[PDB]
C-alpha cells in the first residue's frame, strides 16, 4: 500500500508554521499582511472558496477582506476597482476569484493587478519570471504540488516526471517548476526530467510515458484515468483534482502499485489555500523591503 | 540517408519574402525598420551576419561598439537613450556581456516594443501564456523550420535538450502548446525536456522514443546514432567551436529521416527571424 500524501494535514502543518513566521516578522515593526478578494457574482461555489481563503487568513494572522460585486459589473468597473487597490498602500495582496463573467476578458483582469500584489501569480510579469527560473510570485496550486513533493521527500532530481495537463494556470507552472534548476536565483529547483502530456497525446503514448515515470501529476480538467498498469512500482501519483469535481486515479488498484499517492479527496484545495497565504506573506515582505 | 533540411536556402526564401513585404509597407508612407545592435568587447561575426541580412531585406542597421569595461549604468543609459529615440525601432544587445553586467536587468531595460530578441520579461511572459509577442528568434526559427519542412508535430513524441531561457525554454513552450490559442504558434506535440542532470540512461531512452529531437545544449557529439529512432527528425541548434552542433552528424544521418546540418541549418534561420521580428516591431509601433 502506498504512502498517503494527505494535503489537508500538510496544509495544517504549513499554516501553523506561517502563523509563527508572520508573527515574528510583524514583531520587527511590520503591519500584518493584508489581502483583498474580489468576488463577482453569487456563484455558491465561488463563495465557499473565498470563505476558505478568509478562514485560513484568520488562522495565520493575515487580515482578509472580501469585496463583493454583482454579475453585471462592467470590465471598466472591475479594472477601476483593481487599480484603486493597486494604489492603496494598506493593501498587500489582491485576488480575483476565478469564475468571472464572459463579458470580462480574464487576461486583462490578470494583467491589471499590480505584479507586486498579484497573489495568484497570473500576471504576465510574474509568469515570465517563473519561466526564466527567477524569483517571483508562483501560482498557488502549482506551488502546492511542488510543496507536497518537497515535504514528503519525493526525489525529483534526475527523475522522470510526467505532467498530464498543460493549462497556463496549473499544468504549465507545475511542469516549469519541476524542471527548474536549483542553482538559479529562483531556488525552486527540482531538476526533474519532465514530459508534458496533454489533450492530444495519443493514449498508447501517454501510457508508455506513465509506465516509465517516477512521478505522475494529473492537472488536466479533461477526464483522464491513471490505471494500475500505467504505474511504475513505487512511483508517486499526485491528483491535482481539476475536473462536479472528480478523481483521475483508479485509487484502489493504483494504491497497490504506487509508492505514494494523494488520497480521495487529495487535500490539494487546502494546500492551494495555504500557498495563497504564503504568497500574501511573501508579497508583504517584498513590499516592506522595497 | 536523412533528408537534409537546408536552413540556409529556407532562410533565403524567407528573406526574399520579407524584402517584398517590407518594401510594400514602406511604400504606404512608412520609414524602413531600423535596428541598433550593441556589442561590448571583441571576438562581431554574428553581427556581420545580422547587418548583412538587414541590408538584403531593406532594414537599416547600425552597430554600436563599446569597450569591454563599460559599466552597467553606462550600458543601461545607452539603452534608455535608444528607447526614447523615435528613429530607432529595434534594439539588440549582443550577448555575451561581461559578468559584471547583470543580464536580466539589461534584458528588462530594453523597451518591450523595441525588444527584437524577445528577451524582455514581458515578451517572455506573453509567450508562455500563448499570446502574440516578440518570440526569441532561434526558437521561432525552429518552429518555422518544422512548419516549412512539413514535419508533423500533432501528438508526436518530441524531446528538447536544454532549458536555456533564451532558446531551450521557448522552443519547448511553443512545441507542446495549443495551436488554438491566440498566438497560433503552438505545435501540440508531447514534449520531454532533458537537461544536464538527466541521467545518461534516461536521456538515451527518451531520445530513442522520440519522433523529433531538438537539441540546444552546445555539447558536441551529444546525440549518437544508437539514440535516434529510425525516421526521426533531428533539429540541431547547438554551435560549438572545436563550428559543430550537438549531433554526430555523419552517423546520425544514416538513421534519422531528416536532419539540420551545422553550419547551414538553424543559424541562418535565426538571423532571418531576427529580421522578421524587426519588421514586426516597426509595424506595431506605426500602428500604435
Numbering used by the authors:
A (entry chain B): 1 to 243, 253 to 299
B (entry chain A): 1 to 43, 47 to 245, 254 to 299
The authors write:
The bmMTHFD structure was determined at a resolution of 1.75 Å by X‐ray crystallography. Site‐directed mutagenesis indicated that the amino acid residue Tyr49 contributed to its catalytic activity.
Our findings provide insight into the mechanism underlying the activity of MTHFD from B. mori and potentially other insects and may therefore facilitate the development of inhibitors specific to MTHFD as insecticides.
